[PDB]
Write a protein that binds this ligand. Structure first.
Ligand SMILES: *[C@@H]1O[C@H](CO)[C@@H](O[C@@H]2O[C@H](CO)[C@@H](O)[C@H](O)[C@H]2NC(C)=O)[C@H](O)[C@H]1NC(C)=O
Ligand SMILES: OC[C@H]1O[C@@H](O)[C@@H](O)[C@@H](O)[C@@H]1O
Ligand SMILES: CC(=O)N[C@@H](CS)C(=O)O
Ligand SMILES: CC(=O)N[C@@H](CS)C(=O)O
Ligand SMILES: CC(=O)N[C@@H](CS)C(=O)O
Ligand SMILES: CC(=O)N[C@@H](CS)C(=O)O
Ligand SMILES: CC(=O)N[C@@H](CS)C(=O)O
Ligand SMILES: CC(=O)N[C@@H](CS)C(=O)O
Ligand SMILES: [Ca+2]
Ligand SMILES: [Ca+2]
Ligand SMILES: [Ca+2]
Lengths: 214, 218, 212
């Protein structure tokens, strides 16, 4: 048939990382970023923060379809992300870089997101390994919330209090779609924050969330 | 049959459900395929970007032939080329937006009702519609209905050579008030108006960090 | 389209990833430098920011590694395939941390297949402000940390943290560590000895081929 993941492509001898066009179960094309280097390679990347050039404080319609630049930061979009994580079993990996260049990460057994009707519900496996600690199981079975759509289990607005979008609760222990605040920041838990990573007051330089059939 | 069944613009591609910026190949009026950068993010999406400065890696002080055909890198800085820019904006009405960024991460912009450049025979004459809006202020209306000039081909209205004088390439009049193809001078410079300058923006003595020029069907 | 020069001829004036066809007609996406010295160069190595680790083994250099988005080594099999039929000039481009440019050029450039240990076959130096720091390495095997093929009793890949056609050991070390300017450490950076010497590591390095 044809390539359906970055796993396929790597196996087919595409060894350099970059944008490749894979085929959704639905088929229908869809060009994605492939990380062929990290942890044996073949990861499809749906989120990337690198320099704070793209504004992530976006609404529902935008997160649905995705936004950003293949040239920089981006969200692959929730419909795509669902299509992508729906049919085998993908394992999520997160990669975080502080402004020292100390890498830290988190690996998870499985990773699925429900369709838009299910509100892009997070179905997270269990923390495997990762020097950044588990700052995401906390958000299991919890709908995705955006500025123009409050779904969080909180009386106020998590998306707005911490200026981001996430599967918020009351509210978060992770906030990778938050403000790009450049290292330690006075403001509270509103940067690119990994609770168990560098706490609620440090915003990483680099954030990447990627998948790969386990 | 791909000339017939492909997209004509970055707008078409947005319509067909490409929401990420990047290089897509579109088909020009003469059926010729061309790979352009689509900015799908800014002010609505569907812009075809034709110039981009960002880090000063590419040298923009080039002769006529090179501006004609295009030069640079999809990976970074670039000019799409005068023939292409003309073919883009010939049959139809396209609006132009200018995006700018300084070294303290201020974003500004300027937008224009229409934007057309003639063919080479007409020396890529600029035909600029009215200023719509922008925090950058207007620094392009001044250059309306002027020829494009390079160092090795002078078509301005200055007794001298603007392109040489201000080390760029533009629809120079006498001489300029914007100079987005000037030297990558990195913030405030001591040299006069030879940077990537937008006069109503940060004047003749500050060169921006980023510049982008893009078109969308009006 | 069989090379980047073909593509330039067909009106592709911007540098970027295009897919060409290997002489056996296998497709391969390569970086085409359409700007330098007349354009048409297929790029097979690139350092620029120090984000990729170049201190790799034989398998990894054989197949290629890195990102289209940044730094990479096209892979030895591909570099062989590319320089297999005909004659290809080599250009080495170097940029320092004051943005000064230096280059080197060579009449011809060929690397043998894996059997002959990706042996280096180089033509005459023609010119370049970096000076000739590659001829010294002509007719040598490629070495990595795990497969030592040099003419030194020790391991050169390990001694100078890179991968090259090491003799005893090197006068160029472009796959060395990204050390960022002048370094006290001896000869283990992105080093071109006739250029900035054994103690300066360049900001940018590119190695490219084009039909002669
Ligand atoms: C664009 O500029 C040209 C000159 O390059 C203008 O030409 C002049 O136009 C006026 C009419 O208002 C004539 O009286 C002059 O004699 C013309 N000079 C030349 C050299 O032809 C032209 O008018 C401008 N066009 C527009 C649309 O403003
Ligand atoms: O390139 C190899 C190393 O660099 C220098 C040479 O003079 C050698 O003596 C040394 O071992
Ligand atoms: C905004 C951005 O990240 N773009 C750069 C990243 S290297 C580019 O590829 O030109
Ligand atoms: C951020 C980046 O890479 N630039 C985009 C704007 S979203 C572009 O104009 O192509
Ligand atoms: C022909 C042209 O414009 N290119 C020149 C600089 S003017 C060059 O890079 O050698
Ligand atoms: C990215 C590349 O290979 N070349 C660029 C700058 S070196 C260019 O064509 O201007
Ligand atoms: C190329 C290289 O060194 N690879 C190592 C890990 S980086 C290996 O697992 O064999
Ligand atoms: C966009 C960019 O320059 N980053 C490269 C670094 S080698 C990458 O994504 O791998
Ligand atoms: Ca609420
Ligand atoms: Ca003049
Ligand atoms: Ca040895």
């Amino acid at each position: 048939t044809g390539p359906r993941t970055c796993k396929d492509l790597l196996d087919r001898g595409h060894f350099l990382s970059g944008w490749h066009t894979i085929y959704l179960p639905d088929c229908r094309p869809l060009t994605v970023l492939c990380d062929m280097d990290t942890d044996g390679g073949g990861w499809t990347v749906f989120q990337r923060r690198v320099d704070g050039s793209v504004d992530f404080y976006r609404d529902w319609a935008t997160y649905k379809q995705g936004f950003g630049s293949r040239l920089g930061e981006f969200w692959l979009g929730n419909d795509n992300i669902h299509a992508l994580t729906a049919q085998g079993t993908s394992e999520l990996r997160t990669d975080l870089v502080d402004f020292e260049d100390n890498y830290q990460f988190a690996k998870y057994r499985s990773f699925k997101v429900a369709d838009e009707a299910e509100k892009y519900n997070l179905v997270l496996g269990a923390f495997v390994e990762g020097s950044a600690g588990d700052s995401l199981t906390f958000h299991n079975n919890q709908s995705f919330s955006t500025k123009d759509q409050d779904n969080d289990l909180n009386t106020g607005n998590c998306a707005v209090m911490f200026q981001g979008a996430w599967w918020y609760k009351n509210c978060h222990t992770s906030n990778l779609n938050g403000r790009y605040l450049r290292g330690t920041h006075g403001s509270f838990a509103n940067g690119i924050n990994w609770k168990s990573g560098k706490g609620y007051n440090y915003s990483y330089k680099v954030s990447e969330m990627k998948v790969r059939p386990a």
